[PDB]
Amino acid sequence: MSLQRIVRVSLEHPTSAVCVAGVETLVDIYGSVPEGTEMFEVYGTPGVDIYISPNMERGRERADTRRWRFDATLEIIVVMNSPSNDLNDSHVQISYHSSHEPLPLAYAVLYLTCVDISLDCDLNCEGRQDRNFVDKRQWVWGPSGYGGILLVNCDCLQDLEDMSVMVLRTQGPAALFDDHKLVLHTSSYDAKRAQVFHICGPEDVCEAYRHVLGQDKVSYEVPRLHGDEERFFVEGLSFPDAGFTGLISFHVTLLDDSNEDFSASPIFTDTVVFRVAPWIMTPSTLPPLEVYVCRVRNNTCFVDAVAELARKAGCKLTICRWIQDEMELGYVQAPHKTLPVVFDSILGPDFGYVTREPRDDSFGNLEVSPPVVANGKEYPLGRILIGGNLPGSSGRRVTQVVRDFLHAQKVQPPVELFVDWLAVGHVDEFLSFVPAPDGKGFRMLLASPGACFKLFQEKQKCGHGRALLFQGKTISINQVLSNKDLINYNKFVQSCIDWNREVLKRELGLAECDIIDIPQLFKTERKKATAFFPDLVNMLVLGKHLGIPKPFGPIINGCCCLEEKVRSLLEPLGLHCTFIDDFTTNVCRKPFSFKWWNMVP
Amino acid sequence: SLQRIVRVSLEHPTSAVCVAGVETLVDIYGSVPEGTEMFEVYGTPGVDIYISPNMERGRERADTRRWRFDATLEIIVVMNSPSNDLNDSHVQISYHSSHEPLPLAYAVLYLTCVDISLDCDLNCEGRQDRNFVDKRQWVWGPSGYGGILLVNCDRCLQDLEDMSVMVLRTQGPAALFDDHKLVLHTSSYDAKRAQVFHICGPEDVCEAYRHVLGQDKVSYEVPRLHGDEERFFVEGLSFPDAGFTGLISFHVTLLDDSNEDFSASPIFTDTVVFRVAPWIMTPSTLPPLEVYVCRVRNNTCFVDAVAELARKAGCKLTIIQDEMELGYVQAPHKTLPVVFDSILGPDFGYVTREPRDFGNLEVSPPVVANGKEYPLGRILIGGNLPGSSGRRVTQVVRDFLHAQKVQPPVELFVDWLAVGHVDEFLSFVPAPDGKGFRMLLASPGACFKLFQEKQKCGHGRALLFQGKTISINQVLSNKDLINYNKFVQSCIDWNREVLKRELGLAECDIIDIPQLFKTERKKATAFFPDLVNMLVLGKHLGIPKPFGPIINGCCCLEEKVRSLLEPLGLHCTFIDDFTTNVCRKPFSFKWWNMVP
């Protein structure tokens, strides 16, 4: 649209120039006009649209139908929308006229060769930005955005189904391209984070893709081995980190090098912009696909129970140093493919890998919230939850490189949580998310010593104060309620959880009606918190199915009081509760229906 | 919006610390009494108690009525004033039944109020009325706010005039602070790019400023050595680069560590956010302050002429321009000129970047283009052709300039030149009408036209280089010279179109200065002294004297450039350089008001 190029003509000899199919050319004179010039005419061959326009005013007016009065502020604009078949097969002639001489005072001839040069990719502009207004040099976020998407499989076999396509259309006379260079280039910065293979030869061969744009390879002269269309495959090599915005740009430049005694000069430049697909976490509220477990010779009942739960949930089960402590499952998305990526600090053919080593703990310190709205901002991919450490602590629970990575994804702005009060220190010990039909589409389950205190008091006042826990050393409800140290420590734990409750309500925009307090007691090991009875909140969420650790609570009228309380709290929301014996894992999930490129961060 | 939950027990009194601003939700830990139907809430003077449904907003006073018991009701406690002694305030929740006259049970919460606030200069004079300022955010634009942090050196006698102040107000009972920690902290990332010195003792002493937040020092327990106010001085250590957004954050955290058998727990956190002041270039259209020259045993007339020009322009003269640029960093309390390299230090900062293995850099006056507004102008970088082996501008410098983010740069085509500087063909002069300036471009076509006009007027035999000499006719009839200058004109036309597009310039904003060229080694050098490569001191212009044709006793090229530049109020002086850097005043526009 806005591209225009100046080409000057000489009265003493013809000029010859190359023009691009889209770009319009300003045709001015190099030197004085004839002596008594008062008027001028412009003529052109079929296919060269000529227009007159004041240089101050917008709007074009046709030129080849009238003799115009000479004005220095008038611009002649030439457009060739169609490429040329032979060099200089079109021309323009400016004739200068006086009111006295019948014949023209002087001719100025400009022969033109039209070439069509275009570098394009998959811009992902279905219904987001009305095309023909897409600045190819930009990548725009939001539902009104556009731009190329680039995936990253690992941070030379047949694995190009994840690479992005890049088409270089160069339609023009062949002879022109033994005089003019076509340089595909990229910055030294972008070269270290992505590579480009040009296909040269049969498409079926695996080594026909030549490594043309690499780590030190920042420029490459493109040979037109396939006529007027060359194909490149772009492979992303780095995820966005603290020092990488995620944008990768490639340019094509046409270089006039015809003048042997002069220097080469640019004629045209086209650009495509790829953004690296961020790594997105999957909350518990998403549908599962494959559960991954690691078992031993004695853990043969937990696996049977989790397999039964996966069967009832439609999910599939696979068996396999921990898959839930040193390993996280997320996904990268692109219009043509969604690839699950593992983050580490084997499990599938369609699986990518990413890792960051510290520059100098466990991944239970990382969770993710369902989509929320808070502080006016909308988080349609949810927010990451990072259990940090208290200011001034010696040990660090999450390395700085992982924090930088998660913040550089920026599609799930993280929230720090207080977990130093726990023995292990995982957020799943006190926090969970389950699907709910009404409300915000889910419920946030928080461990609550206060809820268990209230329930035990209610059961004691109902005469069942002597019911025993750990029935299937046992302890009664009365002995727990009368243990002053236990109750006071659980009040402290309740306040610790209240801090996180307020933080989560503020940052996730949650209301009290969105929270459910699961009764859960704790004890001290060692000056930190561990579960008194098996942690009910640290459950497994497979859609509407819940694998809840069996608490072995008091037995009243032949039913576990804690199991029945958790049923009373969770079943009216459509979930089916299963209590798994773990006293005697990771889930891969489906991507969000919301596309991350539609988000405006 | 901050709120903190504190639970009370029916069997024993609870005790808590509350922050002056924050409101506390007071709930019960455990069941309510047996036949509870109503409740009352009472508090000491200075403890505002409110009742509110947990689903609905809006508070209602609490200590004037007996309410019906509802689990969804929240009791909110506010203590806007600090306490003098521990637990000098208290709240009492009494539970009532319609049968027992006396309350069923009391729940007592003793409260001690402390006031903790970490503040800096938020720069919110008339942009945001400070009641909506999120201290955890730094917002660009004319409706923005946030702390500014300057950088004096990017590679302790009296250099605290450039550091930013940071006040920690901690007003409360002294005993409280032998049980609770005050931790001032920052990330390991930000710690490597800024430092913080706590002042402890007399202001006149040089070693009273203790290095408390450093490169590996990411946390520091603050002693209340001055009562209820501690002072810290923050010094920025790094400019924004490709891997640094320029934001530095410091937090204060109150840690309850009273429970010996339990773990420490957070109570309150406050934050201040500093942004590093970007490095801003100064275009030729800004008023000069001090010209800097480097001389030799010869060239004593050029220096005298430059001194006369500086004198007539009000500027000062002191005794380069390559591998060295002069810009400025700005903050509401100080503007410091910073030199970027690849005499002394009176109010002068320093920055350098070594490659990972400056005539090529200029800057435009403020412009508007493509809908965007560039009130600090745009940087102009003469780059290299894509297929060229050598690089004229290193990648680290490009990353630095793009990270400054306040003058988005524009690449220019300069490989056709022998040296390759943008000032060889490009200049900016102030103009009264139109926009704030005119863009001077070297034009072989203009000189061709002028020589043709002078030849048709009979003066075709006037000789250049008179005061080796060549006539107008010999130049016009030199076919190789004219063709090469046409090529040079097209090379400059490429840059003209790029500049018009990226700077939003019109043809009426451009002036073509007649300038011929010749070939040194396949590249371009000035035929006669380059007229466009001039010195701009306000309305005064030091133009390299062209030894062109003399017609009627006056140089036709000098008179042509006068005809072109004097009707704009400029005064032209032609200095003999055939036989420098300028420090300028900052933009009136403040960079923090820009929205990039």
Short mmCIF file of C-alpha atoms in Angstrom, two decimals, chain B residues 95-233:
data_model
loop_
_atom_site.label_atom_id
_atom_site.label_comp_id
_atom_site.label_asym_id
_atom_site.label_seq_id
_atom_site.Cartn_x
_atom_site.Cartn_y
_atom_site.Cartn_z
CA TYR B 95 -23.44 -15.07 70.87
CA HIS B 96 -27.05 -14.92 72.01
CA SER B 97 -30.17 -17.07 72.12
CA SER B 98 -33.76 -15.91 72.52
CA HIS B 99 -33.96 -17.93 75.78
CA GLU B 100 -30.79 -17.27 77.79
CA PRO B 101 -30.60 -13.62 78.94
CA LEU B 102 -26.81 -13.70 79.25
CA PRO B 103 -24.69 -14.32 76.14
CA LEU B 104 -24.05 -17.95 75.27
CA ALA B 105 -20.35 -17.35 74.67
CA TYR B 106 -17.76 -14.60 74.24
CA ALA B 107 -15.03 -14.54 71.60
CA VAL B 108 -12.26 -12.02 72.25
CA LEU B 109 -9.68 -10.80 69.72
CA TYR B 110 -7.02 -8.44 71.05
CA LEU B 111 -5.53 -6.26 68.33
CA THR B 112 -2.29 -4.32 67.99
CA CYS B 113 -2.16 -2.02 64.96
CA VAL B 114 1.08 -1.32 63.10
CA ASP B 115 1.50 0.97 60.08
CA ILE B 116 3.86 -0.42 57.42
CA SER B 117 4.39 1.48 54.17
CA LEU B 118 7.13 1.32 51.53
CA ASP B 119 7.08 4.39 49.29
CA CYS B 120 9.17 6.16 46.66
CA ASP B 121 8.72 9.11 44.30
CA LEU B 122 5.81 7.78 42.24
CA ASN B 123 5.87 10.72 39.78
CA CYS B 124 2.13 11.38 40.02
CA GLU B 125 2.10 15.18 40.05
CA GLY B 126 -0.94 15.71 37.84
CA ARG B 127 -1.46 12.44 35.97
CA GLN B 128 -3.04 10.13 38.56
CA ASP B 129 -4.64 11.42 41.75
CA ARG B 130 -3.02 8.97 44.14
CA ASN B 131 -5.91 6.90 45.47
CA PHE B 132 -5.97 4.42 42.54
CA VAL B 133 -2.23 3.78 42.15
CA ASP B 134 -1.39 0.08 42.17
CA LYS B 135 2.08 0.18 43.74
CA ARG B 136 2.92 -3.09 41.94
CA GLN B 137 2.60 -1.57 38.45
CA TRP B 138 4.50 0.93 36.29
CA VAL B 139 2.21 2.44 33.64
CA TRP B 140 3.32 4.38 30.56
CA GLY B 141 1.54 7.40 29.15
CA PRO B 142 0.14 10.80 30.14
CA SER B 143 -2.07 9.03 32.71
CA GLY B 144 0.79 6.97 34.15
CA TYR B 145 2.86 6.78 37.32
CA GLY B 146 5.81 4.95 38.83
CA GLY B 147 9.31 5.37 40.20
CA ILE B 148 12.18 6.54 38.01
CA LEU B 149 15.69 5.16 38.45
CA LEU B 150 18.77 6.71 36.85
CA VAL B 151 21.95 4.96 35.71
CA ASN B 152 25.30 6.73 36.01
CA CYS B 153 27.62 3.97 34.77
CA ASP B 154 26.98 0.80 32.73
CA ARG B 155 30.13 -1.05 31.62
CA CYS B 156 30.92 6.13 46.96
CA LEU B 157 32.18 9.60 47.90
CA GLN B 158 29.33 11.84 46.73
CA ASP B 159 27.03 10.32 44.11
CA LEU B 160 23.71 9.98 45.97
CA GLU B 161 22.14 12.93 44.13
CA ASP B 162 21.26 10.55 41.27
CA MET B 163 19.99 7.69 43.44
CA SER B 164 16.28 7.34 44.19
CA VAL B 165 14.93 7.64 47.73
CA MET B 166 12.88 4.87 49.33
CA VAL B 167 11.10 5.43 52.65
CA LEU B 168 9.96 2.59 54.92
CA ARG B 169 7.49 3.94 57.49
CA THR B 170 7.01 1.42 60.34
CA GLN B 171 4.92 3.04 63.09
CA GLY B 172 3.99 0.68 65.91
CA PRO B 173 4.84 -0.60 69.39
CA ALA B 174 8.55 -1.29 69.71
CA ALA B 175 8.07 -4.64 71.47
CA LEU B 176 6.17 -5.93 68.44
CA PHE B 177 9.38 -5.69 66.41
CA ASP B 178 11.34 -8.08 68.62
CA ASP B 179 8.82 -10.77 67.62
CA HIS B 180 8.08 -9.86 63.97
CA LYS B 181 10.57 -9.52 61.12
CA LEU B 182 10.70 -6.72 58.53
CA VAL B 183 12.32 -8.18 55.39
CA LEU B 184 13.17 -5.86 52.51
CA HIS B 185 13.77 -8.08 49.49
CA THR B 186 14.01 -8.23 45.70
CA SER B 187 14.38 -10.88 43.03
CA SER B 188 17.73 -12.42 42.13
CA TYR B 189 17.17 -11.00 38.64
CA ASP B 190 16.58 -7.40 39.76
CA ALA B 191 19.35 -7.67 42.37
CA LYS B 192 21.95 -7.96 39.59
CA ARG B 193 20.75 -4.75 37.92
CA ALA B 194 20.29 -2.36 40.88
CA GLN B 195 21.48 -1.94 44.46
CA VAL B 196 20.11 -0.41 47.66
CA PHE B 197 22.01 1.27 50.51
CA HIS B 198 20.28 1.72 53.87
CA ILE B 199 21.31 4.87 55.74
CA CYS B 200 22.18 4.13 59.38
CA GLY B 201 23.45 7.10 61.35
CA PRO B 202 24.34 10.70 60.57
CA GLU B 203 23.59 11.98 57.08
CA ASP B 204 27.00 13.72 56.96
CA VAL B 205 29.00 10.48 57.35
CA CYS B 206 30.09 8.69 54.18
CA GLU B 207 29.92 5.14 55.60
CA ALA B 208 26.50 5.41 57.26
CA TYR B 209 24.97 4.05 54.03
CA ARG B 210 25.17 0.27 54.44
CA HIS B 211 25.14 -1.95 51.35
CA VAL B 212 22.00 -3.89 52.24
CA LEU B 213 20.52 -5.02 48.89
CA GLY B 214 23.23 -6.08 46.46
CA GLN B 215 24.13 -8.52 43.72
CA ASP B 216 23.88 -11.70 45.80
CA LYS B 217 22.09 -9.92 48.67
CA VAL B 218 18.41 -10.43 47.83
CA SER B 219 16.94 -10.06 51.35
CA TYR B 220 17.68 -7.87 54.35
CA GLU B 221 16.11 -7.60 57.80
CA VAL B 222 15.52 -3.89 58.41
CA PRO B 223 16.45 -2.62 61.89
CA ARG B 224 14.30 0.23 63.19
CA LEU B 225 17.32 2.37 64.06
CA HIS B 226 15.50 5.69 63.44
CA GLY B 227 12.09 4.91 64.96
CA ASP B 228 9.22 4.75 62.45
CA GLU B 229 11.10 5.75 59.27
CA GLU B 230 14.04 4.11 57.50
CA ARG B 231 15.67 5.52 54.37
CA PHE B 232 17.23 3.65 51.46
CA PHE B 233 19.03 4.93 48.36
#
